Ligand binder design. Structure first.
Ligand code: COA
Ligand code: COA
Lengths: 390, 390, 390, 390
């Protein structure tokens, strides 16, 4: 079976408590489902299932993926579900959507992810009561998204572990971070995020605001400001707020169908999904997940690293992005050519389809034939997907 | 590709704030993962992926499926993820496990579900702040588990909608509820849940407690006690706490591999997965989901309704179970022969795998050749799976 | 036994979440305690007891009055206690101080009120647990400070009740609220609050900040911004944000001792306490209570209403404040000459000391032989006290 | 002047989350207010003011003393307020009431205290919002009731400090504790608490329960079970749950009037208040407070210690109780003859009116002439009162 990505879209990525501060993830997801449909010339009546990665759905109500689908006019007879493989989610959803089509269970899938880190609630288990003494209201964003479940420390600490093992200086991490900002700024000013972004209308009271630019990108980002930051996780460390990605909101998706179906419809697809892989690694160095996952995906495609024309490798932290690049040895000039998540941001459950969006539109723009998208995953995993142009 | 269920297990289903009141879902999952492995003679080192349905993960930390896998000794090099299609989740995870094998991405999967409704927290979005006045702490079990996201009302009200469309008296619903209790009691007393149940040790300061019986089942349940209850959702209604399922905790899973892989290993499998389906319906009558799902599953198998030897159709509410039975027209004497959820309970994300467990072990013990498991799903969906013995 | 207020001091009154947003009451209380000691030339070790009114103590630790006293340098030998007569609490504390001395139980007392409405938390009783469903986190500032415990409604609704019985038009309340603004803007600029205020140092991190101005007074207040406000409590109402007092922070106190003592210490006092009283009235019309309270205080003094040259009468609302003026019949050109609580603020537990400070320093200023300070109290009470300058 | 206690009553003392687990303090207070009215044969319309000690009022609404008063049928024309001197409050309100009569401000007062430690909430300051992170829900029972504001540790730590100074072995403390339990079992079983207890009806959904017995008293308390307990604060220390009082709920009151009034009305009072005293000490050793307070009270009464026929001295902890006794040298056999707070419980704001009740009725039944009630006070204070039978 040959599955293509007929169309794709993403919202702009919102800053923490920024543009999307009070927008539920399923509203972002609904806009992105409408857009992939419009972009492909496929009607919502035609969709069989919607599959959305999402890590932080607490308080949002029954299966936000169904909410997003219904809001986008996807008929009640279709189905929808959410899934959670942490930062891998929005990419793994695409692979799962491909499998629906490959096994003959569906013809048309919309797959990606959505996340509102801003709207994630604080919680406490209160059923058994608290007979005496203080208790914590727990931030679900930190607890369920950002804290290792085995070791009890933030993802930032796994990044420090990688910095130590790979001997990555503060200087090198900072330079990588400044480069991410500067590349993202240039791509933004040149209009290279236009094709991928679908504008999102934030409704208010005193006026609707259209959001169509990635607001987390820092323009004119200096090495000096990066260098002046204090280590954010270890007092004698190297990982800072500047060389780590952010807390962000957004959604991203792809519309999938068979290659034979896109041909019937006269759709020029954004690419054929040639392989995907997911592999585990030690939780303590979770940032290394893209290494075995990329290698396995490439093996499954029958491709050498040198065959790749473009790469999107998620920048959760400069320390891990640098480790991945060192080990794989791919030309860094083809990696995150338009910036990465240090600059763009990291809306967890949407990230994987966010970078897939960026890869597919840049692949189209430059005429690149073979690309790969890859993410590290909390708790020690990687996910990778190989895309070829038709 | 022919995928078999090599082994299966579930915990006892705990009562709300009962035996598992302070046991995290992933601990229940870890025991069920260890058990399917032990029962199949497969080592944890051999597992490629763990896929666990779970609707209420809030506060449990990063990717509870990975937590369960790790605690069960599944290697760091395997992967694990969570998914949510509400009541359908634990069955859908099984079909998703099947698909990983079918597409050559994995050889051995443990799939199912887990849920701790008891441990589900209360929450409030507090990031903007609360400058002045009262705010609501929201019960995530109700909000995210049991309330329709479109109409704002409980799943119970959708049961009333179905009661009214199908003209299902209070007396009919209560008789069905009493029967489910009395069937479950008889199965329990005769030992028919022993094979499917893996005991769970609840670790305690003042002593360990082994839980190996379904504690929600009411022994000696009378019609009069059903008849005395007030409607729980509408005041001229008919759906009560007695003729609905409960709020419950448990986990349930299946170990999957190819039919050829089971042969090599000398495993006598519990069943071959012959087909599965998921379809949507109107959220207002979500309890009718099993009707289209089961019919589509049967069509994919090439079976008639009359070919089934055993059926597990989930009893979210008497009202909907009755409607499903009436429309399908299957012999009621082959449906839920050991009782159903009204008696056994309804640990949401686990339910689909719990009923699968019950199906497979009853199929083995009676020598039934063809079986079907189906559930209704909040927000208007159904899932069904057809199993043949080999 | 004749008792005299040897000295007095008060913080400026802050607005809600403003100057004292993160400053505990007891710290504001300590500044005041020290201020009065210094002002009279009395050593802290000479004080027998600190009596501080305070309505909103939750979270602040054991006996915040004791905390005030110790942080002010009052040694461990002295005693301290808080009390609560809601709005009259800070005047009643002065009466109680007076009482200790005239019973021979003490020689020297510091008495006033303190309040941090800003630091008042949300709370819920959670020892029993909350087995299922949403619950409310309660704003203690509102539940314990501004909600009638009998009927269940806010104090501005008792102001609506007094507006209907005393036939006060919406235009007449705006007239009184601008006139108080004008009068307090006048005072502030004219330097009349300098003496009574003791500066408070809000220890920041990037900067300490000397608060010495009443920052709830609105400069250049007209009838227009007043008469374009929506009724805050009824929909067809006449009470508003601008003709009611504010939510505020602050502390206030007096240094008490016997007449003969003050003469021994070479202290020229601010005034002698000749009488005081508290009376109850209907909780529905709680703003009525300064009428019977002021008559009783006045009769205990052996005075007449026309004998008064200066009067502080607390403006919780402009309907209740206009009502006391109209019934008692005193000349309103001697009533709150430096403005009122609508302008200055309503720091509950401190209010009565506050208005005591203004009366005492203003009396001292102009040469007024006889004072009266009086306050209405939620729950249907009044408090009053008659002062003679020596 | 000469004030007498015309009558007195108290509820039973409830166990933490026991009989009064869901009964508000003012409800207990209301029942004790109605009791002292009834027992004195004085009508509620005659009461000038109600003064109740209360330490943990968060979330009970406006001034819970006015709530106990209005529910007791005290008319709206009276006044009511609460006060807080921690464990002293309940006895201190009595001296406060006596002061109101001595200074001609009232003829008739009801005074004592109330407390529901069970119903004390958890709280957090949430006004600015919590942008990121866990935050604490603070148990006001512990924060505001049981934790020293200066040193930040429990009252039972102050009890360790006292035990160290006085060289009071683990055995000595337990011997005092078991005696106190055994004294109270005896008083309970012989009906010595019947007079002072007024029954309280807990209104409920499935039945009214009448509570008229102290439920905290341990029957059959032995030295050997006392000895089996672990230290509750210091891990090489001596203060245990067995030799410290507990967390309890209750209310207690006395009705005060001049000796001449009581003669007018033919009332036989329960005692003439002869003196009272409060003093401060080091908070580190707050349990020594009763020493200067009782010695100063006795100096004010003109009495020697050996003139006392009966003493109630509060047992917040066996360590401080033993210390107090050793210093004062009074015959232990007249101290807490019906047992003490270790047995009976320690409902904070009510403790002092509680032991005042206990002393009064025992003074009446054995024909004792002279009596003293004293308590230690967190933050380092003592309070005492001398009582002569008429
Ligand atoms: C690191 C983290 C705690 C910082 O979050 P934050 O509180 O919203 O950021 P802060 O406002 O505190 O940042 C501190 C400073 O760094 C600055 N900063 C960030 N990037 C910068 C850059 N490129 N140059 C200069 N300054 C920068 C901010 O402007 C801020 O300045 P200020 O405190 O003087 O106002 C948070 O973003 C985080 O958790 N990141 C990791 C996300 C993650 O783990 N994702 C998944 C991992 S697999
Ligand atoms: C119906 C529901 C709201 C009731 O809430 P609940 O608090 O758990 O109700 P309880 O189990 O305590 O039952 C109430 C009373 O009836 C009794 N009772 C419960 N089940 C009974 C039965 N089957 N027969 C007779 N009596 C019964 C209990 O003993 C209890 O006693 P009480 O009179 O002293 O209160 C809740 O169970 C529910 O939501 N059920 C459906 C869950 C659901 O929707 N799942 C997924 C939907 S697709």
């Amino acid at each position: 079976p040959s599955i293509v990505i007929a169309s794709a879209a993403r919202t702009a990525v919102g800053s923490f408590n920024g543009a999307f501060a009070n927008t539920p993830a399923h509203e972002l997801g609904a806009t992105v489902i409408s857009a992939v449909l419009e972009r492909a010339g496929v009607a919502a009546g035609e969709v069989n299932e919607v599959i959305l990665g999402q890590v932080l759905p607490a308080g949002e109500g029954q299966n936000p993926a169904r909410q997003a689908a219904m809001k986008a006019g996807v008929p009640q007879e279709a189905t929808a579900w959410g899934m959670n493989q942490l930062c891998g989610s929005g990419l793994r959803a695409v692979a799962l959507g491909m499998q629906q089509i490959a096994t003959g269970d569906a013809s048309i899938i919309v797959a990606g992810g959505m996340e509102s880190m801003s709207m994630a609630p604080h919680c406490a288990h209160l059923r058994g009561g608290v007979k005496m003494g203080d208790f914590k209201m727990i931030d679900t964003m930190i607890k369920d998204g950002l804290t290792d479940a085995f070791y009890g420390y933030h993802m930032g600490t796994t990044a420090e572990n990688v910095a130590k093992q790979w001997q990555l200086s503060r200087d090198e991490q900072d330079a990588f971070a400044v480069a991410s900002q500067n590349k993202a700024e240039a791509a933004q000013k040149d209009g290279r995020f236009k094709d991928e972004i679908v504008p999102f209308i934030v409704k208010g009271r005193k006026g609707d605001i259209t959001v169509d630019a990635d607001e987390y990108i820092r323009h004119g980002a200096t090495l000096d400001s990066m260098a002046k930051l204090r280590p954010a996780f270890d007092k004698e460390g190297t990982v800072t707020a500047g060389n780590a990605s952010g807390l962000n909101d957004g959604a991203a998706a792809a519309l999938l169908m068979s290659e034979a179906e896109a041909s019937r419809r006269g759709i020029q697809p954004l690419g054929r999904i040639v392989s995907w892989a997911t592999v585990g690694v030690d939780p303590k160095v979770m940032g290394t997940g893209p290494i075995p996952a990329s290698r396995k995906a490439l093996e499954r495609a029958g491709w050498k690293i040198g065959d790749l024309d473009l790469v999107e490798a998620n920048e959760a932290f400069a320390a891990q992005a640098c480790a991945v690049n060192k080990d794989l040895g791919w030309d860094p000039s083809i990696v995150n050519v338009n910036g990465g998540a240090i600059a763009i941001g990291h809306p967890i459950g949407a990230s994987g389809a966010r970078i897939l969006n960026t890869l597919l539109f840049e692949m189209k723009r430059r005429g690149a034939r073979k690309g790969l998208a890859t993410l590290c995953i909390g708790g020690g995993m990687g996910v990778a997907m190989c895309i070829e142009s038709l």
